[PDB]
Amino acid sequence: NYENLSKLLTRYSTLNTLIKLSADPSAINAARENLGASAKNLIGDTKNSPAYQAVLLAINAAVGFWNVLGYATQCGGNANGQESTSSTTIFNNEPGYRSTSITCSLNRYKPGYYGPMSIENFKKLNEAYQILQTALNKGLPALKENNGTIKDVTYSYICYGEGNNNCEIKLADGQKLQQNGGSETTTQTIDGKTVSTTISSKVVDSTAADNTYKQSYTEITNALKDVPDSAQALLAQASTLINTINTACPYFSVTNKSGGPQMEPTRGKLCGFTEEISAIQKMITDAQELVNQTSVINEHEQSTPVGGKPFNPFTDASFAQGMLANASAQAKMLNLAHQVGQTINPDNLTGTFKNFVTGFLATCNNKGSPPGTVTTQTFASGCAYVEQTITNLNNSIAHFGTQEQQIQQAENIADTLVNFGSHH
């Protein structure tokens, strides 16, 4: 126990320095200036921002996960999770085997846990996949840009075979959508905003030219318009994507190519990958908590100068709480960003989870194409710039070294003032 302040500051002199600054408006204002500049580094920059790189990493991990395993994931049936006697249902722009389509055509077996994924769940997954791949390709906005949108996310699937009812679409009023040439408007709520969808149906007969299936089919085209592309929005689509896999927990059996890196175990249930899916869920959760600080930083602008009569840290210090909230929010953003990297960075991983990441998720088998590109060799590899993103996260963090100090200092000056400011 120290009786008085001189003994205390002889010892911890950096503290003496801190008190000197906390009583000096020009220092306090220079810190406030910095909080502004770093704030812009996080929530306004993109490539230079740990925060941004972390959000991108989380999303990419989720997408990558599905690129790696979705060709192997079995699926089928008819609507409402029912088995089918003879229903092939094909989803376009998916990382299928030697293909840019995944075919869901497993009959008789009952969709569910340790079974095929229902077409109902596949549809849900697919939407998120298409949205995310499109956003990734367009490029993600800086964190502050929470009012942007993707002009057009479009995808189709086709239905064929006896009794296949997956392409019958029921509407908001109740009437069935006209199977041949019909066209209509869903809306839904993504994020907190309303998004028009144009659903359109189309029948193609077996005789008709270029029908490479030689069987009469129904094609459903979904055209979404003005889809929000904020972090908060896309994280939510990732969340859907991964949770839909985890919840449906379908059966998967990979064809392990010789020479390559080796999948373990070779067949099973997708929610079996518990380490990987936890990581991906945690990453998304941390990134959401990361993007939440954006609203705390905005709510406490630090531009207005502080300072008439000489400055009095005991009474002139209302701004302090705001400053502290802001600095603490920035430091949380940084730490959460770091943490997102650490969850997946294979430098810290062991055994089967590490090999998933180095062997499969981190890799790509196209020849590098822009983000969001599905190709006929996309499957069995992440194809989502994980390794690059982990690297760019680090690079961004390393170029944040100064700012991080400034944040800490601001936080500490603010704290000192709140502290003096109490008493009253």
Epitope: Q342, N394, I397, E404
Partner: nanobody, 113 residues
């Protein structure tokens, strides 16, 4: 979760020094590492940093003169200092980025005349 810096002391202007930091793997593994310094009268200043692949970057106050480096096999961080000036007088500290919130003892570096 440990940080230990060494390799400092008293040198002459233009002199050169090699600082070492032995870091725990919890700190070091798969992390950006970096060098920090605290001068009398002032607060901890960031000096340099290096990613796990080995890409370094430096504060404008030392660019050209200092060189950061890491030995991934042995959890070791090095700052190679050249053309030292009296302004570089400080305690030098090593940490990951973003920082583990308990710091090392540091290692004193003094430049004189």
């Amino acid at each position: 979760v440990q940080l230990q810096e060494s390799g400092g002391g008293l040198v002459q202007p233009g002199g050169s020094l090699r600082l070492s930091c032995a870091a725990s793997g919890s700190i070091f593994s798969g992390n950006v590492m970096g060098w920090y310094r605290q001068a009398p009268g002032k607060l901890r200043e960031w000096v340099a940093a290096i990613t796990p692949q080995g890409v370094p970057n430096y504060a404008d106050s030392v660019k050209g003169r200092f060189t950061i480096s890491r030995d991934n096999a042995k959890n070791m961080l090095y700052l190679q200092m050249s053309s030292l000036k009296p302004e570089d007088t400080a305690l030098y500290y090593c940490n990951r980025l973003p920082n583990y919130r308990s710091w090392g003892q540091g290692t004193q570096v003094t430049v004189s005349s």
